[PDB]
Amino acid sequence: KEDGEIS
Amino acid sequence: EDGEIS
Amino acid sequence: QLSKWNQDSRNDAMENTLLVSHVLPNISVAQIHNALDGISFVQHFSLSTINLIKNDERSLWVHFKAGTNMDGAKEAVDGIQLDSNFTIESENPKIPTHTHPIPIFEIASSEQTCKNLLEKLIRFIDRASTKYSLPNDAAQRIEDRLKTHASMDDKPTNFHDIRLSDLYAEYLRQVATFDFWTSKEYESLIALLQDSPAGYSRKKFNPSKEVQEENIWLSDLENNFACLLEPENVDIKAKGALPVEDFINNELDSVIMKEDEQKYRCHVGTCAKLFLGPEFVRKHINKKHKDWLDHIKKVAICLYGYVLDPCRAMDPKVVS
Amino acid sequence: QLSKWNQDSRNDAMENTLLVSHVLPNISVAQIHNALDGISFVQHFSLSTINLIKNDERSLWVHFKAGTNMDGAKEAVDGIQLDSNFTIESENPKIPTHTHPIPIFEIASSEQTCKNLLEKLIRFIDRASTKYSLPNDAAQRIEDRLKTHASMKKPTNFHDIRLSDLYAEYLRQVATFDFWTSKEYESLIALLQDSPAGYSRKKFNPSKEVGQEENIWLSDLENNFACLLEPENVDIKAKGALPVEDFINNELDSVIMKEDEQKYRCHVGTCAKLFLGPEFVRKHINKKHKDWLDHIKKVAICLYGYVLDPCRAMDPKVVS
Amino acid sequence: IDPYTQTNAVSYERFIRWYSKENHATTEDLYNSLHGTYNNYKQDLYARTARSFVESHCDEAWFEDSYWVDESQGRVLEVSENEKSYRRALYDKFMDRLDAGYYDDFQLPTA
Amino acid sequence: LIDPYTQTNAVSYERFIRWYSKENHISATTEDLYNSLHGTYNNYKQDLYARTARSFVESHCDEAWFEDSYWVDESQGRVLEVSENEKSYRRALYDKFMDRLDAGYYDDFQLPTA
Ligand SMILES: [Zn+2]
Ligand SMILES: [Zn+2]
């Protein structure tokens, strides 16, 4: 996951 | 004065 | 004999107003706000623009609240010393008589031009709406009447737009106190009517005496020269391009679509990955979608170059 | 039959030149440089502008050094493979024949316009001198020649028209620039694809007017509207004002005279104080000469406001 | 002498003459040509005189109240709440008139 | 008939007029109108050229010619400067002209009349 990722 | 020459 | 509208404009403009003649250059607006703000039955005051070719004096008009006894008004104002050198002496207000309406040129009544003036008219109505904090439905209501209630050919092909132009113009005379035909604003109706007391007439447009291909050709040519000699002064936006930096920012704003208050998704290629902030997506694009960003960078530059090229190659589809 | 000048142009353009037809879009310039930079008796190559309405193919013209065997040249180039898809086959260069000179509009010959163009022609001569690193006296030499050596012949513009045609002709022959279409070209032959017969002038009948007054009134009125609707977009400099901060900085840049390297004198009224740096003076100005600065920043603000007031009062000296 | 250097406005006729000589004069024709040049000459004249005009009038009360704006010395030029009322009255009169078909038959006269 | 101002394709003056005619309820036989709409059409095209510019650039950007014309970026080893060879070429065209000027080649010269 990357910065701020919200799966 | 400031930065003033004589 | 003055028209109903001109005669009515005249009476309105004078009603519950006093003239104050010989207003000196040294007299300030603050001095006048002193003298008059204290008085309750004064609603507004107007000051003519100085005209030095004639002389140093202006005119001051005091507009009183409706149903003001105008003997009391004089009594209430007469004797007021604005400064040592000027004491107020009111008198009944005047407007130049026995004049002919000022003729507006042929060209103002032509298809092309009339419609330009229409866009300007609308814009001046909206300006006046914001400036004087009025309703924003003036142009709306005017055109609604003009459509619904017709008026009796003897008419040009331009009639609908002239009628409307004429009335948008008349709205600005009465409400804004703007003389569209001179682009002078005024502080009151009486002030405006000093310069256009019979209003304006229209010179009729002759489809025969129309004579402008040559002026288009020249215009376009001089515009081309500018692209080569003064590119920095040319309206890039008008030509459907942007400064590289600006173009690239507009691509980032478009692809970082806001799903919720604190949810911002990537829309670059098939990518639909979400983020909890707008600037969280802006990092993503830098890392993964380099290829795409290079492309945008290249397009931004080339697009700038292209539009500034007088005789560039052109899409076949955009010629006959 | 072709004029000497057009016939001569033709021969000059083709002399020691080879045509390469059917030049594909994918073919880069870098590719062509590789192929020809080595060949010493080649001086220039010139690629045509793609014309996609007609065809996806440009034309490449190879220009050889003076006194070149144009069989040695064909042989030296023929068989060069620029890429897999296009190998070079040289052909004798062509220019479309049996054409009528492209007529320029009447307005180009009118005095007001003829003079604008004259100023634009000079600006393109000078642009060509910097771009191509030529002498800067081309303009002077052409004018001095015509002043000295008269012609055997006529309108009231003649002196200007004559000069304009030669200034236009200079650009055609030297900077390969078709002033009339504002197209730059890479070689004489390339230009002469679109103007092989050159151009002609349609005569100006002074009797003919296009309501010059009307287009002016309308122009002036629109310029006036812009002052109210789009002040930010209006060219303040042209109207004799400066944005406030710039105005002020230009004043300080006048009253600050640097006497050596770290010796800066204040020339505001009866002052002669000296400072290390100019910004040390700019302070001194703020401390000692406040009154003077207060006035300057006042005058800058009003001058801005003034020039943007469409119906401002004006010096009687600048009317009639 | 060159009008483009002088602070005073030269008449359209006197201008023509300077131009006639300056560029080597039927006037008849020139009259119909220099209408625009004279407009641009005046535009230019206005522009370079602009600063002088401000310099002399900047301390006069009439000129300051027009143009002099500065948030540091409380010199704003807002629209008075008094005036806003005055305008809304003129608005409302106009729309009452509109709705009573006052302006149904209205149009600028012809010349 | 549809809004040309929305369409990416160009439209003949004759066809533009007809749209204008119906769009604004103008009872005029197109040659009645021919002189009026010269400017309007010109701006229609300017406006078209404008909003189609980006799409043209996007489709041609990777073609060799288009890159050579417009693509500049020191950072990706692309620029446009006048070849030392061309300066030479142009200088000889100058010197011919001035030799011709001085030899009286252009004394009788003037753009023919129509
Ligand atoms: Zn993504
Ligand atoms: Zn000092």
Author numbering:
A (entry chain G): 31 to 37
B (entry chain F): 32 to 37
C (entry chain D): 207 to 358, 362 to 420, 422 to 530
D (entry chain B): 207 to 359, 364 to 530
E (entry chain C): 70 to 93, 96 to 182
F (entry chain A): 69 to 182
From the paper:
The S. pombe MTREC complex and its human counterpart PAXT target specific and aberrant nuclear transcripts for degradation by the nuclear RNA exosome. The Red1 protein was shown to form a scaffold of the MTREC complex, interacting with multiple subunits and linking individual sub-modules together. The CBC and its partner ARS2 are implicated in fate determination of Pol II transcripts, including their processing, transport or degradation. The Red1-Mtl1 core also recruits the Cbc-Ars2 sub-module, which has been more extensively studied in human.
